[PDB]
Structures are given as structure tokens and as C-alpha cells.
Amino acid sequence: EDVTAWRLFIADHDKPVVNVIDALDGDKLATFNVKGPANLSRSESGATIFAIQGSAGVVSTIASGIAFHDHGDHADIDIDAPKLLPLELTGKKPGHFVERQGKIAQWFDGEDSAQILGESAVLKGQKNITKVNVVAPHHGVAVPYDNYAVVSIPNPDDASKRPVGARVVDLQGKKVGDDALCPGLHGSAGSGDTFALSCETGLLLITQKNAAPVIRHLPYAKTLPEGSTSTLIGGKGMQYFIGNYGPDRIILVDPTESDSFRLIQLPTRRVHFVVDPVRAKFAYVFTEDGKLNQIDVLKGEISQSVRVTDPYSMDGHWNDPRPRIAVADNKIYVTDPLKSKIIVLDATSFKKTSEISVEGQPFNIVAVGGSGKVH
Amino acid sequence: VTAWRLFIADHDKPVVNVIDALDGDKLATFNVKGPANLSRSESGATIFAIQGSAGVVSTIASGIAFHDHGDHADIDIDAPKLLPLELTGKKPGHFVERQGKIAQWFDGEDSAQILGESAVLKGQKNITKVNVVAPHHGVAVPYDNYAVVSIPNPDDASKRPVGARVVDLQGKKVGDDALCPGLHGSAGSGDTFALSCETGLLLITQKNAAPVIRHLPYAKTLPEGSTSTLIGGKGMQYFIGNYGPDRIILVDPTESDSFRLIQLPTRRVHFVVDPVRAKFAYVFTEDGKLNQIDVLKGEISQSVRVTDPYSMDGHWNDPRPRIAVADNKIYVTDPLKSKIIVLDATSFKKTSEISVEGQPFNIVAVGGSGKVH
Ligand SMILES: [Zn+2]
Ligand SMILES: [Zn+2]
Ligand SMILES: [Zn+2]
Ligand SMILES: [Zn+2]
């Protein structure tokens, strides 16, 4: 038969719980108790979910229960119950998580090393870690490559400031080549074979073929107004990045083209954004007015908006829970933490079709899934 | 005299259209029983329309065949036509032709079907049924008086097969099992046939005895990943496989360092080899680009945007482009726009868009050049 399966993973803002919900009909598949409130990341394969618990000093790992086999003209889908895996990563203040092609790099803001591992080992229940020295504890990022990593460089005068650039290291932590300076580095995302790190002058763009990774700097277009990016997302089916650019602007970046940057002005301040992995021409931004906004990436504009929640005006209460967006199959999911629900929209009509009740303050959300044959 | 033809299956309708590759003109439309995957014979004389949901494989005389004088070669050009021969059985799957021997797998049967290409064009339905122990999603490779067949999982055959073995044409085991967990992916290139699995490749060769299977493990220097789908060089001996969805591996079975990795810009939608200029292969990626692979250099040598993006997320059977090479052109189906894009294989410049009613999807090309008089 032919089976479609998608799952939501939803972290509570206050309680150390991750809920798993069937995205297609909203029923509860599992509740996992962890140590602290979590931020969530999925692997590219979708087979693992990582729950980063900064205040608890741990990263927990969940087997999503959905995995695929690439068989050319068809795909197979393997479906099992979601489960908490034995793999935990421990260290002071876990921060940015980056996974690509099964390679995993977990940053720890309070440690002098990042932890590199692999998804295939994790799924088998093996913990096989490489600790890579990052010189001094700082709020940084590590990007995993074949036999190398790219790591942020701590500010040499006060490591509590933002990092000052990035460098290639081998997996013994040995610097390779020259430092790529990028003052005020913060923000990271991948899109296809290109990884981006944002800073005050532009983006660092990283690729790897059959040698060490190569870092190039793309400065912000001179046609842009003053600003810089501190948070990034990356297209899935098409190569691009979207960054913030001040609190009510975003930029769209094409790393494959010379006419690289386009500015979109939002009517109110940005709460969250995500790309649509299924409909590659679209991304979504949620704004403080309570509206979900459809971004037409190729036209470089907001193509439509719809009210989903009451306003979450962020001026003055920057720390409180706010909506987060996920996409699964042909639906868009928006958490409404203050109402203990998730709003479900049809992606193409851009209208609400259902809502899912989730006790607590459902906050961070990621989705995995697809369809395949079952023989 | 030159003649090339394209056979194009609709994604949803039981239709196979035939187009003259040189001017784009529609030549024929064949109505079959269900939506078809398409395979061609090595000779190009026959096209096979595998209709999984319909329980049948139909056979089409392409209308282009070659016969010799020794060497030389004449090109015999006729209208394409449906042939009476049909293979029937539950859930036809993998088609493997090797040297005019054809092996058709049926996921729902306990036997695979072996036949000759010649015997099809001559109207003969002489099917040899080779027992494969239990129904499973496997593969059979035909040899002279033997076949190599996948081994079903002994627990439940519903899982992926666990290896391959040589059998006689009754299905009686010959020799020892070649274990290869999670076996899937099959292609031939020159004197070697490859099956991929989670530990590496099985490589099959044959002289005057049973075929011989050896295991080529993935090089320990490779990143984590595995291969589950393969294509084989035609005119140069190599294999190309996936290695996760946005990478391919190039495999040279004659080199001790057999594996070379290539990073794709985005995830792979389809790939084929170039049978005319054998040092090239082509990968279509979800970003809508066609990528030329220079196999000798081990690199992507050029890329061009051909379609809108077709993300590999969604459903596995959302309609997406497929590639075929004919003469000095490359053809890319664009199912959601009811058309085929034509590019010059050297310059990668688009020369034509051929509209085809429906959702043109799977595509294969046959043809060549010979004398007539
Ligand atoms: Zn298959
Ligand atoms: Zn399969
Ligand atoms: Zn941060
Ligand atoms: Zn002649």
C-alpha cells in the first residue's frame, strides 16, 4: 500500500515536555518528559528530533518513527512509534544545533568544545562523540563537514561579546587556512549545498566538495538600507536564505546569483519565519499583529496575509511565549501558546481548516514526514 | 540515416506517447491498462511499459532497429507498434535486460519471468518462470542458463531483501548466498552488473560457468551514507548511485580506490548516463536545474535552470521531471506544465518546448544512425 505520514513535535514553553502529534488528524502519539523546556530541531532525513534544553545542560534525542528509503522511481516509508533515544548530549548551556547529511554539531555556550556526532550511530543507540575545541566558551555555532568543521571565533578581548568570524578546523581542532572575519557573527542556516552565517557586514557562505570546506563572504547589497541579519532560514527545494534585517524587515538572498538581495518590509514586527519545504516558491512570516504572511520568494513580496491569533505585541515583553510556524504535507501549523492550541491552515488556500488542542503553552514546533510504499 | 524517438508515459493516465526526437513531432499514442514506468532494451528495438497497479507489462516495437553486415550497420525504421506479448502477474517491478535476455520481477508473485528480446519482436510468448522463494520487492538479473536473484528476508519477506544468490532457471540455488542487507539498486555497465545494499555493492561477472558475485564494501573514507539506486555507464564502465539524496557516488569497479563523491546543489530528482558521449552523465535536481557530470573529472561541469522547482518533499509520487538523452539533445519532462523541454547537449541552451497533453512523466529514448539504400 501507499502510506502518508507526518508528525508534529511540540515543546512546551515552561514545562519540560515534548508532545508528538499526528499532523494529518491531530491525535496525540506521545508525550516525552525531559529535563528542561526545549528548543527543537529536526534532522534532514527527518528520522531524529533533537530537544535542546539550555537551562538543563542537556540535549535529548527522539526517534521520530518516520524514515524513508530512496529507491529511484519510488520511495519506501518505515513507520514506528516515536521514542526517546538513549543518546543525550551534556554540557553547560547547549545552544545552536546544526545537522546536515547525517553529520551533527551541537554547540555548548558554556563549554570550550562543541560536540560532533552522526545520526546513523545515534539511531542505533551509539554515542560516538568528537569534542572539537572552540578556544573559549562563547555564544557561537559549529557547522559539520566531512573531516572538518566550521566554527565561530570568540571575541579575543571579551568572549561574552558576539564572535568575530569563523574558521575551518579539522576534527582535532587544528585551524585550516585563514580566518574568515565577520564582525558580530550570529545567525545560521543551510540551503542545499550552501551554509550561511550572518554578521554585521554580510553573510559567510560555506560549501564543501572533495577538500576542506571553502568560506566566501557576501557583503550586504549596497542597495539595502542600514541593517544586518542575526537570524536565518534556508530554502529546501530551492536555494535561498531569508534573514531578519531589523525587527520589521526581512531580506531574501540568492547565494547562486549576483543580484543576491531583496528587502521586504513587514507591516509589524516579525515573530517567526519558516520556509515551505513542499512548495519551494513560498516561505511564511508570522508578525506581532497576529497575522501569518505568505512570502512569494521569486517575486520578492508578501503575496497575502491572514489573521491567525490575537496580537502578540512584543514591545516590552520580549521574553514571553509567542507563535511558531511549522509546515507538514499541505498544511501550515501555528502554535498559539496562550490559548493552548495549534491553528491548522490549508497551505494553498491560506485559510484555517482546523485547530488542535494541546494542554499547556505549546511553543516550539517542528514537523517531519512524507509518503512512501509499504510492501 | 539518423532516427531517434522518445516514449513518454503520463503520470496518471494509461498513455504512452511517441515523439520524433529530431523535430519534436508526435508519431503515435498507445493506450495501455495503467500508468506505466518505461524501460528500453539495450538494442532499443523494444520498449516495455511496466504497469504495477494493472498487473501487466506491455511491449512496444520502437520502430528503430539495426542489423549488420559485419561490422557496418543498417538502420531499420518502421512505425512504432504495440506487440501482442504481455507479461502478467501481481505488481510488476524491476526490469533488467542483459544481452537480449530480459528478467521481469513481480513483487506479488513467487517467480520472476525471463524471456528473450528477439522472441518478443517475433511474437513469441515463451516465458521461463524462475522461483524466487517468496514474494518480495526484489530484482532478478539474467545470465546464460542462470539468474542472480534477491533473497527475501527470512523473517517476513515484506522487509527489504537480505542479499542475492545465483540460481538455475528453475530457481535451484547454485553456490553460496551473497549477503548484502537492505539490498536495492541495480544497474549494468560493461562486463559488470551491480546491486547496492547497506554495506556496499555486489558486483556480478560471468564467463562460461555460473555468474560470480563479489562484494565491494563502501570505502571507509566515505562519509556516512548508502546507495539504494544505480545507473550504469554505457560506453565507459562505471556506476553512479545516490549517497543520500543530495549526493551521488561514482564507482569504478577496476580501481582499488573505487569511490568518488559528488555534492549536488539540491536533492536529486532523476539521473541518467549519456550513451553517445560516454564520459558524461546528467542529474536533474529539485531546484529545477539540469547538471552535467563529467565522470572523468569527477565534477559537475555545467548546470542550467530548466523547470520551476520540484521539491523532493511532499509525496513520493508527486509528478516530477525525468531526463532522457537522444542524439545531441537532452529532454526533460515538465509534468505540471504539460510539456517537454529540449536542450542542446553541448551548449545546454534550450532549443524547444514540446507540449504533450496531460502530465508527461517517465521518458526513454532510442535511436541511432546507420545506412539504408
Ligand atoms: Zn525498487
Ligand atoms: Zn521500494
Ligand atoms: Zn543564538
Ligand atoms: Zn547496408
Author numbering:
A (entry chain A): 31 to 405
B (entry chain B): 33 to 405
Paper excerpt:
Two high-affinity zinc-binding sites are identified, only one of which is competent for transfer to AztC.
This structure was then used to solve the structures of native CkAztD and PdAztD using molecular replacement. The crystal structure of CkAztD has two monomers in the asymmetric unit while PdAztD has 4. All zinc occupancies refined to > 0.7 in PdAztD and 0.4 in CkAztD. Part of this variability likely arises from crystal-packing effects, particularly in the CkAztD structure. A buffer molecule introduced during crystallization is also nearby in the pore.
